[PDB]
RNA sequence: CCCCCCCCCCCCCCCCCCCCCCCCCCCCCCCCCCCCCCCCCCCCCCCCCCCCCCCCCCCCCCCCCCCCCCCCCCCCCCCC
């Protein structure tokens, strides 16, 4: 685990996090490991981190006390894990995050409300998940959100009520690639506050569905398609 | 030569309630085993593409060297 300012533990087959590192480290990387559990009790010493890349590992579920100890954590990477369950208190105490990757966690459904308790989030990733609807909450949140990725999901319909959350959000990227959406609801994109870019790569529309898509983009601020 | 009415004690049967003890079924939680699917760690094997390295072979170019063939010149000498 070589580290001078950047802490790297890539491809080192770690089972538990190390406990001998400088306190003032900002980024700590443990990609490509098998941290089966990530206890919060081992991070008493680690309280000055900003980015935490713990992706490509085998974490089952997370605890609220993990980011209690981190008041300055800003990047939280959970790529290729088993975090299939989310709760209101999963990301409650930590709200300074501006980056949150959840690619390939086999997330099935968003139950009630995982993302109100943060307002400074910028980029949200939900690629390679089992989501079938774009509903991520009940009320309106993610005011400062700009980047949203939902590629390689199992979404077949893009309903207007599913995007009522983003009535006051400026979104520059809606990554909905590799999802077999076959129905478009009126006002689905008008519910979005500020839509700037739509990405529908590898998605089977056809000419008629493309025409309906363009009709649904009437009177909006889209820049890229 | 008889019936009736009171009372004690002990029975038997029947309905209700409360106890233990057990059986069957079911619920909840936990453990073990088997099967299916998925993720990650490595160490890899096979195939294709791309890039280089060595050696070698064919063809070509350039510079030659030797030999053969042809032509010209210089000097010397004869024939009529």
Q: To which residue do tokens 């820049």 refer?
A: A223
CB atoms within 10 A of CB A19: 10
Tokens of A173: 């990227």
Question: Among candidates A6, A5, A20, A113, which has minimal Cα distance to A53?
Answer: A6
Cβ of A32 near strand B (under 7 Å)? The reply is yes
A34 nearest nt, CA–C1' = B40
Query: What is the stated resolution of the deposited model, in angstroms?
Result: 3.3
Alpha-carbon span A122 to A145, nearest angstrom? 4
Half-sphere exposure of A178 (CA within 13 A, CB side): 11
Question: Among candidates A207, A153, A215, which has minimal Cα distance to A184?
Answer: A215
Q: Collapsing DSSP states into helix, strand and coil, what is residue A207?
A: helix
Tokens of A34: 């098998």
CB atoms within 10 A of CB A176: 20
Question: Among candidates A102, A100, A87, A77, which has minimal Cα distance to A27?
Answer: A77
Whole-number distance in Å between A155 CA and B55 C1': 60
Question: Among candidates A123, A125, A121, A143, which has minimal Cα distance to A193?
Answer: A143
**Residues linked to residue A28 through DSSP beta bridges, in sequence order:** A7, A52
List chain B nucleotides near protein: any atom < 7 Å from a Cβ.
38-42
Q: Are strands A170-171 and A157-158 parallel, antiparallel or unpaired?
A: unpaired
């Amino acid at each position: 685990t070589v580290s001078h300012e950047v802490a790297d533990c890539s491809h080192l087959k770690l089972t538990q996090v190390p406990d001998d590192l400088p306190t003032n480290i900002t980024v700590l990387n443990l990609t490509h490991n098998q941290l089966r559990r990530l206890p919060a009790a081992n991070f008493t010493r680690y309280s000055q981190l900003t980015s935490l890349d713990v992706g490509f590992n085998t974490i089952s579920k997370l605890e609220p006390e993990l980011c209690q100890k981190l008041p300055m954590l800003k990047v939280l990477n959970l790529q290729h894990n088993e975090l299939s369950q989310l709760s209101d208190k999963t990301f409650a105490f930590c709200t300074n995050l501006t980056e949150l990757h959840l690619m390939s966690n086999s997330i099935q459904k968003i139950k009630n409300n995982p993302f109100v308790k943060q307002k400074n989030l910028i980029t949200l990733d939900l690629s390679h998940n089992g989501l079938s609807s774009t509903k991520l909450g009940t009320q309106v949140q993610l005011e400062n959100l700009q980047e949203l990725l939902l590629s390689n999901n199992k979404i077949q319909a893009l309903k207007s009520e599913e995007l009522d959350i983003f009535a006051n959000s400026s979104l520059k990227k809606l990554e909905l690639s590799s999802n077999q959406i076959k129905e478009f609801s009126p006002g689905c994109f008008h519910a979005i506050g500020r839509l700037f870019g739509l990405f529908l790569n590898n998605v089977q529309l056809g000419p008629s569905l493309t025409e309906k898509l363009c009709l649904e983009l009437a009177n909006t601020s889209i820049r890229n398609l």
